[PDB]
Amino acid sequence: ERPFSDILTSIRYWVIHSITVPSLFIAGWLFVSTGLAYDVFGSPRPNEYFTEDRQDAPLITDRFNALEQVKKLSAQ
Amino acid sequence: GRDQETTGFAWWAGNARLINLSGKLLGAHVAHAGLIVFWAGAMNLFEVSHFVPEKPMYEQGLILLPHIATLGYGVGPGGEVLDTFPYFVSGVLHLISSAVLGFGGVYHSLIGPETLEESYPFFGYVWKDKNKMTNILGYHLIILGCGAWLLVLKALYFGGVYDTWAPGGGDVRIISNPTTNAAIIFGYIVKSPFGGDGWIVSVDNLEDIIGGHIWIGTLCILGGIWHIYTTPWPWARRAFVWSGEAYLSYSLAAVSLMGFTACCFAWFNNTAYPSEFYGPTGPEASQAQAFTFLVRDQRLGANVASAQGPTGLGKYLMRSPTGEIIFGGETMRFWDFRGPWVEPLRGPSGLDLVKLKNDIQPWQERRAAEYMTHAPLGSLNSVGGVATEINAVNFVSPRSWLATSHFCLGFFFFVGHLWHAGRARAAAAGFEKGIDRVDEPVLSMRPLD
Amino acid sequence: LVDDRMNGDGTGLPFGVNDGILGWVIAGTLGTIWAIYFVSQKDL
Amino acid sequence: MTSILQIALLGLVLVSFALVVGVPVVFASPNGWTENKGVVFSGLSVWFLLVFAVGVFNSFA
Amino acid sequence: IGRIPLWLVGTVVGLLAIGLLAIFFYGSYVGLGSSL
Amino acid sequence: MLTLKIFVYTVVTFFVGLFIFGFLSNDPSRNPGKG
Amino acid sequence: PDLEKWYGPDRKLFLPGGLLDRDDVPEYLNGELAGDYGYDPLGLGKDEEQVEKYRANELLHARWAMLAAAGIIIPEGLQANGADIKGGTWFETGAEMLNGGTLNYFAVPFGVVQNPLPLAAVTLIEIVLLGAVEKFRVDGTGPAGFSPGVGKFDSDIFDGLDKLYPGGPFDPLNLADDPEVFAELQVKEIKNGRLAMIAVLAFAIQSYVTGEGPYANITKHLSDPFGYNLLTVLQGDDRVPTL
Amino acid sequence: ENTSLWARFCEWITSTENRLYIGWFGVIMIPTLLTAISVYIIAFIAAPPVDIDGIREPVSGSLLYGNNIITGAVVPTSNAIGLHFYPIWEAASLDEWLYNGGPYQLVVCHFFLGVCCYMGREWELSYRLGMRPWIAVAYSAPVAAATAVFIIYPIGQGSFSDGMPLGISGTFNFMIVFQAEHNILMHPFHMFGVAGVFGGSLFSAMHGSLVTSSLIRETTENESANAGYKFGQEEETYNIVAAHGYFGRLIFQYASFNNSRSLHFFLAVWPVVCIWLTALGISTMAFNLNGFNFNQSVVDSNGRVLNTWADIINRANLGMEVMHERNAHNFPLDLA
Amino acid sequence: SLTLILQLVALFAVVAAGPLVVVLLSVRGGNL
Amino acid sequence: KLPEAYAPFSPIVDVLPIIPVLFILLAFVWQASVSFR
Numbered sequence A: 001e002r003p004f005s006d007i008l009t010s011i012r013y014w015v016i017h018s019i020t021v022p023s024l025f026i027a028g029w030l031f032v033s034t035g036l037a038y039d040v041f042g043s044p045r046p047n048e049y050f051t052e053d054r055q056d057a058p059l060i061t062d063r064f065n066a067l068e069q070v071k072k073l074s075a076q
Numbered sequence B: 001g002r003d004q005e006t007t008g009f010a011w012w013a014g015n016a017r018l019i020n021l022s023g024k025l026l027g028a029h030v031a032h033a034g035l036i037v038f039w040a041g042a043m044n045l046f047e048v049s050h051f052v053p054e055k056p057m058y059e060q061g062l063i064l065l066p067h068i069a070t071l072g073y074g075v076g077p078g079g080e081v082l083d084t085f086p087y088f089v090s091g092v093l094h095l096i097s098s099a100v101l102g103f104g105g106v107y108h109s110l111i112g113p114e115t116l117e118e119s120y121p122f123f124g125y126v127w128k129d130k131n132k133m134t135n136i137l138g139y140h141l142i143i144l145g146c147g148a149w150l151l152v153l154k155a156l157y158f159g160g161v162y163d164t165w166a167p168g169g170g171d172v173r174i175i176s177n178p179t180t181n182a183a184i185i186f187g188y189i190v191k192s193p194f195g196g197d198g199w200i201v202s203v204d205n206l207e208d209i210i211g212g213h214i215w216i217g218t219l220c221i222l223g224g225i226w227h228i229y230t231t232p233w234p235w236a237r238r239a240f241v242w243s244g245e246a247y248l249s250y251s252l253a254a255v256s257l258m259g260f261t262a263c264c265f266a267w268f269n270n271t272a273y274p275s276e277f278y279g280p281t282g283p284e285a286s287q288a289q290a291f292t293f294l295v296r297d298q299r300l301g302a303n304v305a306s307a308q309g310p311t312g313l314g315k316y317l318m319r320s321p322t323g324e325i326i327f328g329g330e331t332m333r334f335w336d337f338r339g340p341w342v343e344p345l346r347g348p349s350g351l352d353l354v355k356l357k358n359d360i361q362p363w364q365e366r367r368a369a370e371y372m373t374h375a376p377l378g379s380l381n382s383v384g385g386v387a388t389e390i391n392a393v394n395f396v397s398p399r400s401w402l403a404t405s406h407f408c409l410g411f412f413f414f415v416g417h418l419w420h421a422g423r424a425r426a427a428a429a430g431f432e433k434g435i436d437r438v439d440e441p442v443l444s445m446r447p448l449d
Numbered sequence C: 001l002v003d004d005r006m007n008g009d010g011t012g013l014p015f016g017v018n019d020g021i022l023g024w025v026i027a028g029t030l031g032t033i034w035a036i037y038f039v040s041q042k043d044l
Numbered sequence D: 001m002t003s004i005l006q007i008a009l010l011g012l013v014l015v016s017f018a019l020v021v022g023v024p025v026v027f028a029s030p031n032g033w034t035e036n037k038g039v040v041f042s043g044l045s046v047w048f049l050l051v052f053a054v055g056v057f058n059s060f061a
Numbered sequence E: 001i002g003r004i005p006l007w008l009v010g011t012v013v014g015l016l017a018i019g020l021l022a023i024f025f026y027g028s029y030v031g032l033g034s035s036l
Numbered sequence F: 001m002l003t004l005k006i007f008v009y010t011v012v013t014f015f016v017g018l019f020i021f022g023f024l025s026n027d028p029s030r031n032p033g034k035g
Numbered sequence G: 001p002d003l004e005k006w007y008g009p010d011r012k013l014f015l016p017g018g019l020l021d022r023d024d025v026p027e028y029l030n031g032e033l034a035g036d037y038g039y040d041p042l043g044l045g046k047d048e049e050q051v052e053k054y055r056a057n058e059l060l061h062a063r064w065a066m067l068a069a070a071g072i073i074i075p076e077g078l079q080a081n082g083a084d085i086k087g088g089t090w091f092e093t094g095a096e097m098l099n100g101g102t103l104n105y106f107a108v109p110f111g112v113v114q115n116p117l118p119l120a121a122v123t124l125i126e127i128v129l130l131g132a133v134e135k136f137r138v139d140g141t142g143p144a145g146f147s148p149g150v151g152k153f154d155s156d157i158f159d160g161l162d163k164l165y166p167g168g169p170f171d172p173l174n175l176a177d178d179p180e181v182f183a184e185l186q187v188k189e190i191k192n193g194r195l196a197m198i199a200v201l202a203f204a205i206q207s208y209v210t211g212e213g214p215y216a217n218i219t220k221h222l223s224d225p226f227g228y229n230l231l232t233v234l235q236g237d238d239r240v241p242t243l
Numbered sequence H: 001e002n003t004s005l006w007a008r009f010c011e012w013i014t015s016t017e018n019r020l021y022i023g024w025f026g027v028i029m030i031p032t033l034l035t036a037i038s039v040y041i042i043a044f045i046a047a048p049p050v051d052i053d054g055i056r057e058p059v060s061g062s063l064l065y066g067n068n069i070i071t072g073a074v075v076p077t078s079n080a081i082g083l084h085f086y087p088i089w090e091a092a093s094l095d096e097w098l099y100n101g102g103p104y105q106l107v108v109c110h111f112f113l114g115v116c117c118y119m120g121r122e123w124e125l126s127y128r129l130g131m132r133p134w135i136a137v138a139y140s141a142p143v144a145a146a147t148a149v150f151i152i153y154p155i156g157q158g159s160f161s162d163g164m165p166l167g168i169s170g171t172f173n174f175m176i177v178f179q180a181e182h183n184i185l186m187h188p189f190h191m192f193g194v195a196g197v198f199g200g201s202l203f204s205a206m207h208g209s210l211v212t213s214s215l216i217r218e219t220t221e222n223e224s225a226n227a228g229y230k231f232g233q234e235e236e237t238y239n240i241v242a243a244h245g246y247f248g249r250l251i252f253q254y255a256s257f258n259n260s261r262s263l264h265f266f267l268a269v270w271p272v273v274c275i276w277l278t279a280l281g282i283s284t285m286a287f288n289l290n291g292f293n294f295n296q297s298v299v300d301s302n303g304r305v306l307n308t309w310a311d312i313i314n315r316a317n318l319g320m321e322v323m324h325e326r327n328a329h330n331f332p333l334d335l336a
Numbered sequence I: 001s002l003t004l005i006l007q008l009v010a011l012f013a014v015v016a017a018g019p020l021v022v023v024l025l026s027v028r029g030g031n032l
Numbered sequence J: 001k002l003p004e005a006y007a008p009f010s011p012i013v014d015v016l017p018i019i020p021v022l023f024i025l026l027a028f029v030w031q032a033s034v035s036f037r
């Protein structure tokens, strides 16, 4: 029935979770330490928040051309 | 230890399992005392390892070194620190005593005798043996009176204590002629706790402090001898409950009262808690700010008695409800503040105009400016200033920390007193586990409620 | 002084007592309650 | 005179760690306190002697 | 099958959780978001 | 206005005395339980 | 009375019940001597005859060290408080009258009197007195004398008297006829004497360390406890502050 | 034998036969409270304006001076008095006693004594009815909240003017100024308090829905289900096993309360401990411990300030701070 | 840093002392 | 700061505050080890 008292007390369970959980932790570490998080989620790095053309907070100020304008206002 | 079936108490009430076990009770108590002295020593060592000499101790987040420095160890005139070795010695001695106490508590907890009554009749006790409980209370009263007299000897013959009311800005003073007059000592006790009186928080001199300590030490010693050589009277036996949980509830109410009272000392009193070590209080910082801006606008060629505020009440100096000359602005609510740097500027009618004009002191101005900069206003991230302030100052007053923590502990312990007093009354009554289901008291009396 | 006041603020008055009549009525009320309690003893 | 004080203090720390790990072990062991009398007494005596040695060597350093 | 004690597993898991929370609290005083 | 203070002090002392000596009036014997 | 804690198999021991069970107490310490705490970390007790032979020297040391501690602490205290002692310090008392500067004896409450006796005469009469005294002790024979207890006792009173506890002439105030009070006063005497030997050893080592008398030590320690103790006198001179 | 006057009075006081139990805690609870209600009704009806800030600018607060029910409030004491005790006898005239906010102190003191003795009386009736006594322990949380907002915060800030005004708009003013001063929203104790009241509403709805949903069918559909319950019965009125099974397959099986005693203890303990935490949060703010300060925390590599939601909350705090007590500050630092 | 390394080693040795004594008592007989 | 003779022991000094928290958590560990009987 596995009432959580057998799975959490079995070395058969714990030999495969001793690699998968650290592997997931290392994958999460590398995902943000290699810039992939900034790549896929569009979050700016601390050195690219402000550009040379603008030194303030960006404003979307448009709806139907928002894609092109946020591409122009992003940090390239 | 025991289990649920053999005692009826669950693990989250496991200490109740040692209500009737005197040896395990003693082991838990001695191990706890070891824990307390361990925190004292460990915090002393941590604070002296994180102590910076060229900064005041209230900027560095210390609470134990101000306590030791108030007694006059490693400090000189003006509140400056001369040596940290006394603090280090106190910390090491507390750590060693904690090791000894922890060994004793662990030994009694694990392999000590379970019950002391059948083998050690002096240390054996049952909760209904009121004579033996009064004997234990008398022994502890002798210990407390000896500790109070030890503090008295420290302030009299063993280097004195730090007087913040000494001329020039405070110094380590030897107490001479302690005020042992019963009228002035107990007038603090029978005083009102409101503004202008402050109950015992408004004790303003080490003479009254040491006189009250002499009185409480002598009273505690005579009361201990009285309890050792007497028994509770029949009126006390009728009025009180004589269970261990009842005695615990009485102690809980007492220590809750002490926690609230010590919170009030830490927030208001600047005599037993010198401002040079604990930082300015709320009233002290507000009055320091008002006085610093007073002397600034006086240096800038502006009249201070005249030149009223926008409300026409007075920007700098005005009248208290009684009639004394007080600092203007919202600091009127702190018009009862008395500090070492305002008293030489204060005459019979409050703040004297000619004294504030010509009897100024650079050390008073510097202390007032430093207290204005370091008001007890901060966030729990240790961000100095009001809640709007920018994360740039790393300072929260030790007075604020002590007051907040001690009022919290006092309130929890008041609720604990409520819980334990109710459970003690219900346990002595017999319905602490529920209603007998065959002898419901409500069905025994008539309807209509 | 345009009007009359008790002027009892501060000064550390015992139980806020400014006139001996106040302390005497404290003593009298407590004493008569204690006397009623003491006479009505040996009950239940 | 400072290096010997540091050595004595490090030995005191090690003896304290050995005590706080083994004394509950010795006490709560099933019939272990009866035969661990000598080793526990030696550990406590060495701990007290090291405390006194650090204390007396603090005045010389 | 019940080889490792459940209390030991819970103690290890709680120790890792407490240390991880302490790591996050330490990260509030250093690096980004620390006003320094 | 001293008379008002005297009256209030008398009433407060009366009620506080009833409280104190009522709890001295063998309060645990008003137990609806056994013992 | 109350001899059930200083005598018998159940009595006060040098370690409590948890530290020291009664099984590893040495078999020759059955609580029949006064002051038996079962204290034998090293093998010196051997058997009953050996332990009583050593108890003879223990009692002699105890009764000597009690007078020693009192005679060390009293004249130094009197000299410090203002008496004309000139040599109240115990470790330099002998050196005062080396060339004939004889000491002053202070017989309270009416003292201050010179002693016109040179060192050779004092040591000669001391030897010819205490040698006879110790010869009387180890032989149990006395010529004749008068004591407040037994009046004009003859030579046939010391025979049959208990070794190390001779009653009669040495007991003028009695208070030892009852065996129970005699036994509890015996354990009182041996405990006081052990404390006195410890005190005399402390006096000697303290004098060697600090160069002044024990009364000066205790007075300066009560004057400044933290500022004057073993760690203060072992520091040599002051200390660089850690500020 | 119960003939003496004090014995008869004690039996009448401790009598459980009264419509409302009085008790020895009630002998303080009743007169102090009725004093507080009497002066509170009279002040709320016809209280003259009160100079709260001490700057000789009075605030009406009472209905007969032009206030409605939402805006009507007993105004706190004058700031000139501060933490001084101001009874009627300490004032020369009733006019200045009303002008300086004396009714606020009288109501606050009598209300604190009344709630404390109400808690004591709750314990006393629990004792005299053979009940377990921790109903007063549960009631210690609103008492703590009232004490924190009426006495402890005036103590910490040094003036009774700083307490919660006895009203509705005055209460909102207290909350707004309080947010300006301490940033209460960013405090963990206030966060636990909010979670406690939200969870208290959630658990009240949960428990009521589970019990009312699982009532045993003893009536028809044309009569009220309450008519199925007879008072004083010993038979259970709902299916505990069905309710527990529904909750278990709703949220979690092994993380559900199968015991009604543990379930009701949880219902008792959760909002009570959370209100304890938020009352202690207010009391710690009284000594100016304040909430989380995250103003200018996120900074980029060039050191420019990157504003956050906490910075917008800072802007709100600034807007409240520059407007609260608009004439009572002669100096910049708000240390009072 | 050396200070950080010593702090971490001391912290780990202390925080492991509790689990060490409990595991040693659980596997060495009982009475806990 | 600490005395110069006791300067290297500062890292073991800094850990010492958290020991009571570790003690109450150790009580919880022991109660887990006795299976919360």
Ligand code: CLA
Pocket: B011, B012, B013, B014, B015, B016, B019, B248, B252, B408, B409, B412, B413, B414, B415, B416, B417, B419, B423
């Ligand atoms: C020195 C004071 C003191 C003493 C000696 C006792 C002693 C006792 N209490 Mg008690 N209690 C106290 C104060 C005290 N209490 C306080 C202040 C409260 C709060 C109102 C309580 C509430 C309380 C309750 C509800 C119960 C007891 C119970 C008991 C008995 C069993 C305890 C046990 O094994 O539980 C085990 C201990 C724990 C499980 C620890 C609890 C976890 C705590 C809450 C974590 C908090 C730590 C946190 C970091 C602190 C920060 C908070 C704040 C200070 C900022 C025991 C004899 C029980 C009883 O009645 O037995 C008959 C029980 O039901 N107590």
Ligand code: CLA
Pocket: B001, B002, B003, B010, B011, B012, B013, B014, B015, B016, B017, B018, B021, B024, B025, B027, B028, B029, B031, B032, B099, B100, B102, B103, B106, B108, B109, B110, D019, D020, D021, D023, D024, D028, I021, I025, I031, I032, J024, J027, J028, J030, J031, J037
């Ligand atoms: C102030 C903290 C404190 C203290 C001093 C105690 C003390 C005690 N508890 Mg207790 N307990 C506590 C908190 C505390 N408890 C809390 C918070 C809970 C709720 C989880 C409980 C729940 C609880 C239960 C259910 C029971 C006790 C019991 C006991 C008693 C015997 C335990 C025993 O011998 O079993 C053995 C324990 C062990 C073998 C664990 C070993 C751990 C060792 C001793 C740690 C020592 C480390 C230290 C560094 C050593 C230094 C010594 C020296 C070198 C300096 C004992 C006197 C029992 C009792 O009531 O007695 C009948 C029992 O049934 N407690």
Ligand code: CLA
Pocket: B026, B029, B030, B100, B101, B103, B104, B105, B107, B112, B113, B116, B120, B123, G016, G017, G018, G019
């Ligand atoms: C709350 C204090 C307290 C109390 C009431 C007791 C009571 C008892 N202990 Mg105990 N003990 C304590 C603390 C206490 N202990 C501490 C702190 C330690 C660590 C050293 C010990 C270690 C200990 C052991 C190892 C044993 C006992 C034993 C006993 C039992 C009988 C024998 C005896 O008295 O030993 C006498 C204890 C001593 C001679 C130690 C010296 C104490 C002197 C008198 C100090 C003077 C007190 C003075 C005011 C300084 C106090 C410091 C203060 C500021 C904290 C007895 C019921 C024995 C037992 O369990 O029976 C089987 C036993 O073997 N205790």
Ligand code: CLA
Pocket: B137, B141, B189, B190, B219, B220, B221, B222, B223, B224, B226, B227, B230, B231, B232, B233, B236
């Ligand atoms: C914290 C230490 C302590 C503790 C726990 C106790 C505990 C106890 N004492 Mg005791 N006592 C102490 C210290 C202590 N005493 C000292 C230091 C002295 C010397 C002055 C005395 C002298 C003393 C005497 C002469 C008697 C007791 C008695 C008693 C017992 C009953 C008291 C009672 O009915 O409750 C509390 C009492 C009351 C509520 C009524 C007294 C009215 C108040 C409290 C007295 C002070 C009035 C004053 C105006 C209050 C100002 C302070 C206030 C505003 C906060 C009780 C177990 C009685 C007893 O049973 O004999 C064994 C008894 O006759 N004590």
Ligand SMILES: CCCCCCCCCCCCCCCCCC(=O)OC[C@H](CO)OC(=O)CCCCCCCCCCCCCCCCC
Pocket: B235, C015, C023, C026, C027, C028, C029, C030, C031, C032, C034, C035, C038, F024
């Ligand atoms: C501001 C002014 C007031 C200041 C008062 C401060 C001094 C008193 C404060 C400490 C008193 C200690 C109380 C312990 C006994 C209380 C319970 C009791 O009573 O114990 C009850 C017990 C029962 O056996 O009796 C007994 O032990 C006898 C104990 C009581 C003995 C004292 C009685 C004093 C006499 C006063 C009566 C005047 C009576 C008539 C007044 C009428 C006025 C018109």
Ligand SMILES: CC1=C(/C=C/C(C)=C/C=CC(/C)=C/C=C/C=C(C)/C=C/C=C(C)/C=C/C2=C(C)CCCC2(C)C)C(C)(C)CCC1
Pocket: B185, B186, B188, B189, B200, B203, B208, B209, B210, B211, B212, B213, B215, B216, B239, F019, F020, F021, F023, F024
């Ligand atoms: C050191 C010091 C000092 C001194 C102090 C003192 C001296 C104190 C005290 C005091 C006192 C001397 C007090 C008393 C008390 C008492 C109490 C607090 C109590 C109680 C309790 C209760 C509450 C009760 C109740 C009851 C009733 C009423 C009824 C019946 C039942 C019973 C009994 C339960 C001074 C400030 C000067 C200075 C600084 C420091």
Ligand SMILES: CC1=C(/C=C/C(C)=C\C=CC(/C)=C/C=C/C=C(C)/C=C/C=C(C)/C=C/C2=C(C)CCCC2(C)C)C(C)(C)CCC1
Pocket: B031, B032, B034, B035, B038, B045, B092, B095, B096, B098, B099, B100, B101, B102, B103, B105, B106, B109, B110, D009, D012, D013, D016, D020, J006, J009, J012, J013, J023, J024, J026, J027, J030
């Ligand atoms: C029984 C019991 C228990 C326990 C309890 C307790 C409370 C214990 C304890 C204990 C204790 C209370 C301990 C203490 C200790 C201490 C120590 C162990 C110490 C030491 C020492 C040293 C070694 C030091 C050193 C140093 C110095 C000298 C200075 C500088 C720095 C240093 C650090 C280096 C529990 C709860 C778990 C469970 C239940 C039961």
Ligand code: OEX
Pocket: B330, H079, H157, H159, H161, H162, H177, H181, H325, H334, H335, H336
């Ligand atoms: O009075 Mn009510 O609010 Ca407490 O902070 Mn300062 O003072 Mn006023 O300002 Mn902000």
Ligand SMILES: [Cl-]
Pocket: B328, B329, B330, B331, H328, H329, H330, H331, H336
């Ligand atoms: Cl202002």
Ligand SMILES: [Cl-]
Pocket: H173, H177, H323, H324, H325, H326
């Ligand atoms: Cl406003």
